[PDB]
Amino acid sequence: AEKRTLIAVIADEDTTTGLLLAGIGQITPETQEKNFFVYQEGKTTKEEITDKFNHFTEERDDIAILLINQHIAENIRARVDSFTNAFPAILEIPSKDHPYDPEKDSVLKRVRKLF
Amino acid sequence: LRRFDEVERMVGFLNEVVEKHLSLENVNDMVKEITDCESRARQLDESLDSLRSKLNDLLEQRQVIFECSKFIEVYMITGSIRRTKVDILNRILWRLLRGNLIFQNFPIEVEKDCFIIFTHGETLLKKVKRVIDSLNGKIVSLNTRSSELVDTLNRQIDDLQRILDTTEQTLHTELLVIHDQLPVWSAMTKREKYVYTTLNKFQQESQGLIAEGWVPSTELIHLQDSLKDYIETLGSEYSTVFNV
Amino acid sequence: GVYFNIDNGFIEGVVRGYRNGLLSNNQYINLTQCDTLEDLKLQLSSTDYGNFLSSVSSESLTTSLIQEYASSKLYHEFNYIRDQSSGSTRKFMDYITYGYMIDNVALMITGTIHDRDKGEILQRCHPLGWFDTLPTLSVATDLESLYETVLVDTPLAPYFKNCFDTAEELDDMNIEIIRNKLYKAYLEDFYNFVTEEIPEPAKECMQTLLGFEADRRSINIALNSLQSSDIDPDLKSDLLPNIGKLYPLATFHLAQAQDFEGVRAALANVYEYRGFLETGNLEDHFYQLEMELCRDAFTQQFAISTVWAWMKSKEQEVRNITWIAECIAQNQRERINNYISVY
Amino acid sequence: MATALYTANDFILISLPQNAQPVTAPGSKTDSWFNETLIGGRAFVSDFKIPEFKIGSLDTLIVESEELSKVDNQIGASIGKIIEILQGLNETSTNAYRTLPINNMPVPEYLENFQWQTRKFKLDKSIKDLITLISNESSQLDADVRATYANYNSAKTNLAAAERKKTGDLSVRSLHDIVKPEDFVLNSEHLTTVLVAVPKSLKSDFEKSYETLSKNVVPASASVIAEDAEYVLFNVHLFKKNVQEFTTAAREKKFIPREFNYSEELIDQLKKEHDSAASLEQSLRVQLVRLAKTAYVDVFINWFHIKALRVYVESVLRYGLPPHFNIKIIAVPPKNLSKCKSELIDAFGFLGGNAFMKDKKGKINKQDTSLHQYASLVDTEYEPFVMYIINL
Amino acid sequence: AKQKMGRVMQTAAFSLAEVSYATGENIGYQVQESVSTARFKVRARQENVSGVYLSQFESYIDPEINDFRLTGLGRGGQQVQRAKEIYSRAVETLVELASLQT
Numbered sequence A: 001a002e003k004r005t006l007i008a009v010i011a012d013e014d015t016t017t018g019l020l021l022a023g024i025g026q027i028t029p030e031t032q033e034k035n036f037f038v039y040q041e042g043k044t045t046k047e048e049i050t051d052k053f054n055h056f057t058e059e060r061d062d063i064a065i066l067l068i069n070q071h072i073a074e075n076i077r078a079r080v081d082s083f084t085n086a087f088p089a090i091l092e093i094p095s096k097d098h099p100y101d102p103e104k105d106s107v108l109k110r111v112r113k114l115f
Numbered sequence B: 001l002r003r004f005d006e007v008e009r010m011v012g013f014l015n016e017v018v019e020k021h022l023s024l025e026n027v028n029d030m031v032k033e034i035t036d037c038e039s040r041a042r043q044l045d046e047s048l049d050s051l052r053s054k055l056n057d058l059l060e061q062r063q064v065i066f067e068c069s070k071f072i073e074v075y076m077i078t079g080s081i082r083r084t085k086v087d088i089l090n091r092i093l094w095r096l097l098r099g100n101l102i103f104q105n106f107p108i109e110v111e112k113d114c115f116i117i118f119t120h121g122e123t124l125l126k127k128v129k130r131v132i133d134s135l136n137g138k139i140v141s142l143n144t145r146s147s148e149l150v151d152t153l154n155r156q157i158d159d160l161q162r163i164l165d166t167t168e169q170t171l172h173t174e175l176l177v178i179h180d181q182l183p184v185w186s187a188m189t190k191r192e193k194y195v196y197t198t199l200n201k202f203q204q205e206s207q208g209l210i211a212e213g214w215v216p217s218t219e220l221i222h223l224q225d226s227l228k229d230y231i232e233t234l235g236s237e238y239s240t241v242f243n244v
Numbered sequence C: 001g002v003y004f005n006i007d008n009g010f011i012e013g014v015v016r017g018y019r020n021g022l023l024s025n026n027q028y029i030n031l032t033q034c035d036t037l038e039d040l041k042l043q044l045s046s047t048d049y050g051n052f053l054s055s056v057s058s059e060s061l062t063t064s065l066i067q068e069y070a071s072s073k074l075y076h077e078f079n080y081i082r083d084q085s086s087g088s089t090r091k092f093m094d095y096i097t098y099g100y101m102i103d104n105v106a107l108m109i110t111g112t113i114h115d116r117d118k119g120e121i122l123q124r125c126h127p128l129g130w131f132d133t134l135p136t137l138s139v140a141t142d143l144e145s146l147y148e149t150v151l152v153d154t155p156l157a158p159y160f161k162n163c164f165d166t167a168e169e170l171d172d173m174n175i176e177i178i179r180n181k182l183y184k185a186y187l188e189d190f191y192n193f194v195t196e197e198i199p200e201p202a203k204e205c206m207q208t209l210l211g212f213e214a215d216r217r218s219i220n221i222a223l224n225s226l227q228s229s230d231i232d233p234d235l236k237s238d239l240l241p242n243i244g245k246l247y248p249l250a251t252f253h254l255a256q257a258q259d260f261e262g263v264r265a266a267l268a269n270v271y272e273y274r275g276f277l278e279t280g281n282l283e284d285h286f287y288q289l290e291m292e293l294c295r296d297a298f299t300q301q302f303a304i305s306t307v308w309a310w311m312k313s314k315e316q317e318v319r320n321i322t323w324i325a326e327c328i329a330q331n332q333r334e335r336i337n338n339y340i341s342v343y
Numbered sequence D: 001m002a003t004a005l006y007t008a009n010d011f012i013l014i015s016l017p018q019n020a021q022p023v024t025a026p027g028s029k030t031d032s033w034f035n036e037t038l039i040g041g042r043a044f045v046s047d048f049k050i051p052e053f054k055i056g057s058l059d060t061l062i063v064e065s066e067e068l069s070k071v072d073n074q075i076g077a078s079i080g081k082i083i084e085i086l087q088g089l090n091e092t093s094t095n096a097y098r099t100l101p102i103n104n105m106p107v108p109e110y111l112e113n114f115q116w117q118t119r120k121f122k123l124d125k126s127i128k129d130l131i132t133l134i135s136n137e138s139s140q141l142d143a144d145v146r147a148t149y150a151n152y153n154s155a156k157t158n159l160a161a162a163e164r165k166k167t168g169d170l171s172v173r174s175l176h177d178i179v180k181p182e183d184f185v186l187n188s189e190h191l192t193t194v195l196v197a198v199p200k201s202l203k204s205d206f207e208k209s210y211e212t213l214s215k216n217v218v219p220a221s222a223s224v225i226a227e228d229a230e231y232v233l234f235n236v237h238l239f240k241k242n243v244q245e246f247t248t249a250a251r252e253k254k255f256i257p258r259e260f261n262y263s264e265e266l267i268d269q270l271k272k273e274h275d276s277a278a279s280l281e282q283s284l285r286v287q288l289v290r291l292a293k294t295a296y297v298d299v300f301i302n303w304f305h306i307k308a309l310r311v312y313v314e315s316v317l318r319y320g321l322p323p324h325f326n327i328k329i330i331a332v333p334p335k336n337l338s339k340c341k342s343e344l345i346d347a348f349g350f351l352g353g354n355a356f357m358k359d360k361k362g363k364i365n366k367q368d369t370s371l372h373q374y375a376s377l378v379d380t381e382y383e384p385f386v387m388y389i390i391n392l
Numbered sequence E: 001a002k003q004k005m006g007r008v009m010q011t012a013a014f015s016l017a018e019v020s021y022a023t024g025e026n027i028g029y030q031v032q033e034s035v036s037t038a039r040f041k042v043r044a045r046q047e048n049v050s051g052v053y054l055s056q057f058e059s060y061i062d063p064e065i066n067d068f069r070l071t072g073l074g075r076g077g078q079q080v081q082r083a084k085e086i087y088s089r090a091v092e093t094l095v096e097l098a099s100l101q102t
Helices: A013-021 A046-059 A070-075 A077-082 A106-112 B002-020 B024-028 B030-073 B083-096 B125-132 B149-174 B182-199 B217-233 C009-019 C025-032 C037-044 C063-083 C088-108 C172-197 C201-224 C247-255 C260-264 C282-295 C305-327 D030-036 D058-089 D107-112 D127-166 D203-213 D243-253 D264-319 D337-352 E002-023 E028-034 E075-098
Strands: A006-012 A036-039 A063-069 A089-093 B078-082 B104-107 B112-116 D010-016 D044-047 D191-199 D224-227 D231-239 D256-258 D326-332 D387-390 E040-049 E052-061
Touching (some): A006 A070, A013 E002, A013 E028, A013 E075, A036 A046, A046 A063, A063 A070, A063 E075, A070 A077, A070 A089, A077 A106, B002 B030, B024 B030, B030 B078, B030 B104, B083 B104, C009 C305, C025 C037, C025 C305, C037 C305, C063 E002, C088 C172, C172 C201, C201 C260, C201 C282, C282 E075, C305 E002, D044 D107, D058 D264, D127 D264, D191 D243, D203 D231, D203 D243, D231 D243, D326 D337, E040 E075, E052 E075
Parallel strands (some): A006 A063, A063 A089
Antiparallel strands (some): B078 B112, D010 D387, D044 D326, D191 D256, E040 E052
């Protein structure tokens, strides 16, 4: 039952802002920290994504779905794959400026061996 | 054409370094000696300016010892700073430590400046350093002597000045074969890019270019007598077609 | 046209030369046939844009860098025309940039409520609306300490005449109110400047180009107030400009417009704006009417309204090139011919 | 003066070394000077001395100063918000809360009996937990005032809405003040009631036309159930099928239908809504005044403690010795603030050091410039001896 | 579904990006701070499929926010508004599809 209500994001600027207009993530008022992480490609470090991921999965116990741009999941690949829980669900979506590759998607990788 | 844009940029870099101190095979082997010399000139210039900066980082450290042993001979922090940030560092440290400081400055003779702080107390000593290191001030802590570090630092100033005198001699040796050769390497590219820019203006229809363009009527027979003699004198039996 | 070319002889003939670089319909069809952003760069290189993306070289070329550099050369051409201006012309050029200064003020004081960094909320600012104390709007939160510290020495200072600061500092709801009210007072002042000192052929065709800005801003304020605003009409009527074709009878009905039909029945009584709210993209209707009003401002010769009619047409050209380069980079071509070309 | 109005007692807090001497009057003690010399002898000087607490270290001394500056602001923000509210309502003087009695003792006298007051605060607690403790109490008291004031505005909104239904104007007015069974039908299989809001001119036109306007309308159903001042309200009885046809035909005539239909539970629930709104606002208002005075006296005591602590702590940091520092708080008469600030600056400033000494004397209260206003925080200028100017 | 979500999300992405550039300044930083509540949340329910208990998500759309103070600016504001509407419609579908993922 209910224990998770937010949908969070790790995505590039135009992708993140748009998700917010649609009305899915928010910033907590008590901690002063976002439940989205903005990213810009080549410009913002691989390390910061890795922390923010930990903030969202393990320190937030209220994130229901963690959405993540495929290009971005590919930078911190170990971190996305190694988390096998559905709590949060990890949903890799094709990153802006890139098509759908079925093997930049962590759940599908796992699916292939043993049906 | 992007090739002879890149090679034009490389000839421009060779023209900046000196100011700072044909068949297809005959172009293809001279672009090789443009690139093979641009590579060594760029790496030797980048191993020279980044070494001049390391030289000035020691000549600024000698002076902040010479101008702060003199201040003692006439909880303190000694370092270098750019001269345009001395007043703002004075104001930020005066607003951080409410009073509680004796701030001097002595000009090192980009222009720079020295500073002495005398942080009278504790618990802000790692916070003054977050003011100094934020606006690019290089503190020089000595803690041993003002006469033992000067010897170990003058044993590096001259040891690195000799590396300057080696690499800059190699630079001026390399520029002798280039300064008398740049009017050939430049004038090759200025007309080769001009050839390919004009060859972009042609048709490329059926494995043969179609050149449509204007010529005065006096020079029609000159084209029909110079193009006809030239395609026959070199062999290559595939004649051109000149229509009006 | 007898005293125009004393101070404005060289200024017009270069702007008239800048007009000839406006892309025609065939030069837009030749851009819609491109397959790559590199092919679109090489197609623009044969126009009067030639080699403006030369320092990019096919790797870092995105559809936003084209919109950056194509508008940057617009801004440098505007600065070249403004540097040769003197007297009433230079003041007319300053009054154009005041409306971009207002947008940069309203974009700079929203980047401090959200605590976004000051170095990245200024690269999104407009280069023509630059005043020397524009980065120093990141010093306070409330309106009074941003006026009385920064915005007194700016030329936007007479425009803070109705912005009532009730000591509530700033949310995102009242910065839009301050923006609309500054633009309202600015449209009033620049209409009175055009009516006062600008000569007669460049007066009647500039009052229409400026009353259109007022009418478009009135319709956008009265239509964006449905979704993200719950305000009284007596406080809404301080946001609508009173210079336009739409003021004395229709902005009253746009002030008490509580529904979409309160806007639509108000704009059905005005003759040239009826049918905009029925079918099609409304923003395309306003941009099309803007270009049809800027086209017949080049047809009057000895007029300083040709500068306004040039820079708005060149901004629409940069918007059309940006829309095409957005279509040919994201591989969507269902609405590539949605550009606007009257030239 | 005339660049600022004062009409209530103003305070400057000074702390000085107990070995000090004024150079504006050499041959005087600091204590003797305050009473006799300072602003024409009309200065009232009050005791404000507090003793030693427990200091962590020298190291700790630094951390404490920083916090003290911050908590002092924050409490200052809170006390200003409480006063602004009490003033705003005008159910308590607007002309006090600058020299309004704390613990029912005049404010310069309150400071005179202020020697480090005890409410929950003792001299045998550590200084770090007194800085923390105090701030937590101040923030709780203010957050309470903010919530009750928040509630009082939501209550005002509800009372206006409910009132409008009870008699306003017909564009949201819902009826429950008329409850007659002769003006409405209920327990009915074929009939319903539609209320029509009609302009006063048009009343005659409505009376003629209604029966024939829709088909199947109860005749002699026109009664004026209610009237405002712009509109007239009628009840019409008609067929459920035919209600659609009446609303539509009526609009063409320039009548405005008000969709209401008689049910007992709606009528009762409209009267209750109005009743609960009134009761909620009235309870909230009394609670709001009582709470704000009680919270105000506690925050006043809290704030002055941070000012006392702070001035002592800052003295200890800048001067070191003597271990006990001579703190006095001087209550200045209105309009003699400018003269006070200058005489102390001249006299004591020399002790802080010549580097420390800047001239930017004067005061601008208008927003024309931001120079001429002392505070150690800014790099623009600095106080030249431990001096805080307190303006209630 | 992954292809579906990516294409629809990106179309709306491109529309917002053009809008940002035309309006002047990087609007998106401003919007992120200002937003501090969410419309689309989920309430989780257990569904027994194939003798195992799974977690499922059911979306509820809260009307806390529907317009901000950045979707109104005047003329520039009308553009953000047209963008916002494509993004809300596109995203809501994406949330429902995301439910199968968990």
